[PDB]
Amino acid sequence: KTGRLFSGLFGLNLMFLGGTVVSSVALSNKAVPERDSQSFLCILMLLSSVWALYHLLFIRNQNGAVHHDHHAGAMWLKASLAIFGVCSIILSIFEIGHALLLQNCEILMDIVFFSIEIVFVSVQTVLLWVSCKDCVQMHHSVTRYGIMLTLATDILLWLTAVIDDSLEQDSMCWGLKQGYVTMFPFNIEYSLICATLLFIMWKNVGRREXXXXXXXXXXXXXXXXXXXXXXXXXXXXXXXXXXXXXXXXXXXXXXXXXXXXXXXXXXXRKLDVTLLFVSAVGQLGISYFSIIATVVTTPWTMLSALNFSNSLLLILQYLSQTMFIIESMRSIHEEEKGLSRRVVKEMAMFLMICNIMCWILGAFGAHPLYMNGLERQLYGSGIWLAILNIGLPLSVFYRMHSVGILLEVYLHALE
Amino acid sequence: KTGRLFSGLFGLNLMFLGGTVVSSVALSNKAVPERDSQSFLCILMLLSSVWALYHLLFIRNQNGAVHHDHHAGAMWLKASLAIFGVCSIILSIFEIGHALLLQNCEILMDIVFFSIEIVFVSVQTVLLWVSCKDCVQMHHSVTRYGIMLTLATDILLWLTAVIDDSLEQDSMCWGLKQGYVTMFPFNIEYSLICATLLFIMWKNVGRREXXXXXXXXXXXXXXXXXXXXXXXXXXXXXXXXXXXXXXXXXXXXXXXXXXXXXXXXXXXRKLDVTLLFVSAVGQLGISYFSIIATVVTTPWTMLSALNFSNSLLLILQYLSQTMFIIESMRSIHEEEKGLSRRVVKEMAMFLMICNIMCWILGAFGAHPLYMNGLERQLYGSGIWLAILNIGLPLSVFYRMHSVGILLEVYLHALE
Structure with missing residues (x-):
C-alpha cells in the first residue's frame, strides 16, 4: 500500500505537468510553439514502450505472475482494444502519406512524431492483450511505477487529440484529405480502453492469490474503409x-x-x-x-x-x-x-x-x-x-x- | 438502495440540464439572454428552500431521526460553513447597494435575484448546522429526493460563479466597486462546503443504527472588512x-x-x-x-x-x-x-x-x-x-x- 501511494503521487503529478504543457500551447498559440507539446509527448512515449518490453520479456516469463481466472476483464474489452487499435494505425498511415505528398512546409518533425505513435500503439496493444489478467508478485516497485508512466501517457494523448484546431476549407490532395478526416476519431477511443485496462491491473498488482483472434483485425480494415465509402459518396434528404x-x-x-x-x-x-x-x-x-x-x-x-x-x-x-x-x-x-x-x-x-x-x-x-x-x-x-x-x-x-x-x-x- | 438509485438518476439528470443552460449563455452570449440562467436558478432555489423548512419543522422533530454520535462530520466543517456563509451575505449586501445607487439601467431583475440568494443561503446554513449528523428513518423517498434537489442547486451556483465576465475598467461608485470585488470569492467556497456536507448526509440516510457559537459569525465581519482594508490601502515592492x-x-x-x-x-x-x-x-x-x-x-x-x-x-x-x-x-x-x-x-x-x-x-x-x-x-x-x-x-x-x-x-x- 505504501508503494502504491509512492507510485500514485508520481502518477498524479506527471499528468498535471504533462497536461499543463499541451494546454498552454492551445491557450496562447504565440509564445510557446506547437513542437513542444509533441516533443514532450514523444519522449514520454519512448520510455513507456521500453518498460513494456521489459515487463514482457524479463518479468512476466519468470515465475511469480499469478493468473486471474475469474473475471479480470473480459473478451470484449480485449476485442474492442484490438479493433480500435488497428484503425488508429491506418489513420496515422493515411496521415503520414499526406505529410509526404504535400506542399513545401515543415519537414520531419511531424513525420518523426507520427511514426513513434505507430510504435507506441503497437507495443501497447500487444502488452494489454497479454498482461490483461496478471497479478504481479515479484517486482512491485518498478511495475507500479511502470504502469502509471503508461497511464499518464495515454491521458495526455487523450488531451492532445481533443484540443485540435481543424481549420477547414491539388487533384490528389483534396480527395485524400477532405472526405477522410471527417470521421469518428479512433485514437481517442483507443486511449480510453487502455485507460480502463491499466487501472484494473494497477489495482490488482500485489493481490494475494489463435484462429479465433485473427478474424478481428482482418475484417476491421474493411470496416474502416467502409467509413470512407460513406463520406466519399456525397443532402437535406x-x-x-x-x-x-x-x-x-x-x-x-x-x-x-x-x-x-x-x-x-x-x-x-x-x-x-x-x-x-x-x-x-x-x-x-x-x-x-x-x-x-x-x-x-x-x-x-x-x-x-x-x-x-x-x-x-x-x-x-x-x-x-x-x-x-x-x-x-x-x-x-x-x-x-x-x-x-x-x-x-x-x-x-x-x-x-x-x-x-x-x-x-x-x-x-x-x-x-x-x-x-x-x-x-x-x-x-x-x-x-x-x-x-x-x-x-x-x-x-x-x-x-x-x-x-x-x-x-x-x-x-x-x- | 433502489430508492437511492431512483433518486440518484434524478439528481444526475438535473444538474446536467441545469449546467447546460448556464453554459450556453456563456458560449453564445447573443441568442440566449442573461436572464434565463438566473431565472432558472432562482426558481430552482425557491423549491429547495421550502423543502428545508419541511425537513426542519415537520420531519426532524418527529421521532425517528437517529443521531450519529461518532464522527458525522466534525466542528471545523460546521464552523467553516458558518464563517464563509455570512461573508457571502455581506458580499451580496454590498452588491445590492451598488445596484440601487446606479446609473439608469435594468431594474429589479438582479435585485429580485440577489435577494433570493440571501434567503437561500440563510435557510441552508441553518439546516446544515442542525441536520449535519442525522440519519433519517421515517420518510426515505422524499428526503433522498429533497437532498439531491439541494445538491444540484449548489453545483449550478458553483458553475454560475465561475463563468463570470468581469469586464473591468462617480465619487461613490468607484470606491464602492473597484477596490471591493477584487477579493477571494466566498459564495464559491460556501458552495463546496454545502456540497461535501449534503453528500455525507445523502449517503447516511437509511443507515441501520450556545455561547461557543456566537463568536464565529461576529468576528468574521471584522475579518471580512479587514479584506477591504488591504485593497483600499493601495506596488512593485x-x-x-x-x-x-x-x-x-x-x-x-x-x-x-x-x-x-x-x-x-x-x-x-x-x-x-x-x-x-x-x-x-x-x-x-x-x-x-x-x-x-x-x-x-x-x-x-x-x-x-x-x-x-x-x-x-x-x-x-x-x-x-x-x-x-x-x-x-x-x-x-x-x-x-x-x-x-x-x-x-x-x-x-x-x-x-x-x-x-x-x-x-x-x-x-x-x-x-x-x-x-x-x-x-x-x-x-x-x-x-x-x-x-x-x-x-x-x-x-x-x-x-x-x-x-x-x-x-x-x-x-x-x-
Whole structure:
C-alpha cells in the first residue's frame, strides 16, 4: 500500500505537468510553439514502450505472475482494444502519406512524431492483450511505477487529440484529405480502453492469490474503409435519412427497457457501476446542448423538430437502459445466499442486437454533427468541436461496456 | 438502495440540464439572454428552500431521526460553513447597494435575484448546522429526493460563479466597486462546503443504527472588512512583500514534513482521502500554469524568478504534507488490532499553526493574481480568470480539511 501511494503521487503529478504543457500551447498559440507539446509527448512515449518490453520479456516469463481466472476483464474489452487499435494505425498511415505528398512546409518533425505513435500503439496493444489478467508478485516497485508512466501517457494523448484546431476549407490532395478526416476519431477511443485496462491491473498488482483472434483485425480494415465509402459518396434528404436510422432503431428500445424494469418489481464488479455513470456526458451533455440549439433558432423548420425529437429520444433510452442494468445486476448478486425470467431473457436478447446496430452506426458511420451546422452557427465551431470529442467517444464506449453486462444477465437467465 | 438509485438518476439528470443552460449563455452570449440562467436558478432555489423548512419543522422533530454520535462530520466543517456563509451575505449586501445607487439601467431583475440568494443561503446554513449528523428513518423517498434537489442547486451556483465576465475598467461608485470585488470569492467556497456536507448526509440516510457559537459569525465581519482594508490601502515592492509572506511561511513547512515522513519509516473516513486528491488542482494546476508563464517571458526580471520560486515551492509543500497525512492515518487505523511519538507530536503542532497562517492569508488576504499581470499578458484574461475560480477555492478548502486531520493525529499522539 505504501508503494502504491509512492507510485500514485508520481502518477498524479506527471499528468498535471504533462497536461499543463499541451494546454498552454492551445491557450496562447504565440509564445510557446506547437513542437513542444509533441516533443514532450514523444519522449514520454519512448520510455513507456521500453518498460513494456521489459515487463514482457524479463518479468512476466519468470515465475511469480499469478493468473486471474475469474473475471479480470473480459473478451470484449480485449476485442474492442484490438479493433480500435488497428484503425488508429491506418489513420496515422493515411496521415503520414499526406505529410509526404504535400506542399513545401515543415519537414520531419511531424513525420518523426507520427511514426513513434505507430510504435507506441503497437507495443501497447500487444502488452494489454497479454498482461490483461496478471497479478504481479515479484517486482512491485518498478511495475507500479511502470504502469502509471503508461497511464499518464495515454491521458495526455487523450488531451492532445481533443484540443485540435481543424481549420477547414491539388487533384490528389483534396480527395485524400477532405472526405477522410471527417470521421469518428479512433485514437481517442483507443486511449480510453487502455485507460480502463491499466487501472484494473494497477489495482490488482500485489493481490494475494489463435484462429479465433485473427478474424478481428482482418475484417476491421474493411470496416474502416467502409467509413470512407460513406463520406466519399456525397443532402437535406440524405441527412434526413441519416437521422431516420438512429430514430427507427432506438424507438422500440425505449419501449423495451421500460417494461423490463417493471418485471424486476413484479418478481419481488465495483468498478463497473461508475463506468456507466461517467458515460452520462456522451448521452446527456451532447444532447441538451442541441435541444437548446434548436429551440432558440428563429425559423422552426420541419427538420428542426426532427433534430429536437432525436436528442430528446436519446435521453429516454439512457434512463431506461441504465436502471434495467443495475436492477438486473442486483438481482444476480443477491442470489448467492418462473415465467418472469422469460421476460428478462427475451428483453436482454433484443437489447444486444440494437446496441450493436447502434455501435456500428456510431463508430463506423457518418460524423453527423459536422453535417448538422445548426449549433455550429449558434456555438462557435472552434469550441463546439471540442464538445464532440469528449462525448462521442464516451458514448461509443458506453455501448461496448453495456453489451457485456447484457450478455452476463442473458447467460445467467438461461442457466 | 433502489430508492437511492431512483433518486440518484434524478439528481444526475438535473444538474446536467441545469449546467447546460448556464453554459450556453456563456458560449453564445447573443441568442440566449442573461436572464434565463438566473431565472432558472432562482426558481430552482425557491423549491429547495421550502423543502428545508419541511425537513426542519415537520420531519426532524418527529421521532425517528437517529443521531450519529461518532464522527458525522466534525466542528471545523460546521464552523467553516458558518464563517464563509455570512461573508457571502455581506458580499451580496454590498452588491445590492451598488445596484440601487446606479446609473439608469435594468431594474429589479438582479435585485429580485440577489435577494433570493440571501434567503437561500440563510435557510441552508441553518439546516446544515442542525441536520449535519442525522440519519433519517421515517420518510426515505422524499428526503433522498429533497437532498439531491439541494445538491444540484449548489453545483449550478458553483458553475454560475465561475463563468463570470468581469469586464473591468462617480465619487461613490468607484470606491464602492473597484477596490471591493477584487477579493477571494466566498459564495464559491460556501458552495463546496454545502456540497461535501449534503453528500455525507445523502449517503447516511437509511443507515441501520450556545455561547461557543456566537463568536464565529461576529468576528468574521471584522475579518471580512479587514479584506477591504488591504485593497483600499493601495506596488512593485509591496507585491514583492506580498510574495515574501507566502514564501517565508511555507519555507520551514517543506523542511518540516520531510523529516516527519521519515520518522514513520523509522518506527516500523473513506471519503476523506479522495477530498485530499481533488484538491490537487488548487496547488498543482494553478502553479504549473505560472511556471511556464515565467519561463517563456523574454526579459527574465529579478522578480520573475521570485514568481518562479514561489510556484515551485508550492508543489513541494503539497507532496510533503500529503504523504505525512496518509502515513499517519494508516498508523492510527492499524492500532486497533517511544520518543518517535514525540517527533510526530512536535511536527503536527507546527503544521497546524502555519496552515492557519496560510489560510487567513489565503482567504482574507489580497487576490494576488490580478496583481500579477504576467500570465494575464500571456494567457487571455477572460479565460485565465476562470482557472483562478477553480483552483483558489479548492486550495483554501484543502487547508481547512487538512487541519482537522492534523488535530486528530495530535490528539491521538498525546493520548
